[PDB]
Amino acid sequence: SGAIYVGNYRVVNRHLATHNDWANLVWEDSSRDLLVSSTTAQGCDTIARCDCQTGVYYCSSRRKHYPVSFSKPSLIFVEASEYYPARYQSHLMLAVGHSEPGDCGGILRCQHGVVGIVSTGGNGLVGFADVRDLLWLDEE
Ligand SMILES: NC(=O)[C@H]1CCC(=O)N(Cc2cccc3c2OCO3)C1
Ligand SMILES: [Zn+2]
Structure with missing residues (x-):
């Protein structure tokens, strides 16, 4: 497990994304195994x-x-x-x-x-x- 938190985005492996990530989906690509969802708090x-x-x-x-x-x-x-x-x-x-x-x-x-x-x-x-x-x- 693990994620990257930058600005108001959360970057995770697409295969480990949660129900909340898919509901707050920004962009995903199966061929890259990536998913980016939006967040309420700022990342560092x-x-x-x-x-x-x-x-x-x-x-x-x-x-x-x-x-x-x-x-x-x-x-x-x-x-x-x-x-x-x-x-x-x-x-x-x-x-x-x-x-x-x-x-x-x-x-x-x-x-x-x-x-x-x-x-x-x-x-x-x-x-x-x-x-x-x-x-x-x-x-x-
Ligand atoms: N990007 C993908 O296609 C991944 C989806 C989920 C997954 O279990 N793998 C296999 C894998 C990942 C990391 C380490 C490994 C491994 O198999 C053996 O060691 C591939
Ligand atoms: Zn570098």
Whole structure:
């Protein structure tokens, strides 16, 4: 689990969105595994606006924050799971690191702010859904 709170927006994995998130839906994309809902209170996170390929992510299944090198956002094939059949997921960045399903929502950050959240894993890899292209998260 995990979310990003920026301005009056809440960013979560689409597969973990609640009934309140869907009732207060701003934007969602199944192919990215992302959902953004509106909030009443102001958030304190800053979204990175950069092309960084190094950062740190939180892994709940190890209670540890790991430094990683990660690939640029791309279209990657993702095996079937409890929440989606086998498909290509867009805007996905991979790194060599530990990840389990319940780790989804863990933040990846660089020196500029939040880069994305854990969304995939397996075979010693961890995948993150990028949020740096969602420029509208910074305003209105
Ligand atoms: N974005 C998606 O398609 C996710 C939907 C929910 C889900 O359980 N996964 C599988 C998964 C995630 C993280 C870590 C893993 C993993 O399987 C093994 O380790 C993929
Ligand atoms: Zn950066």
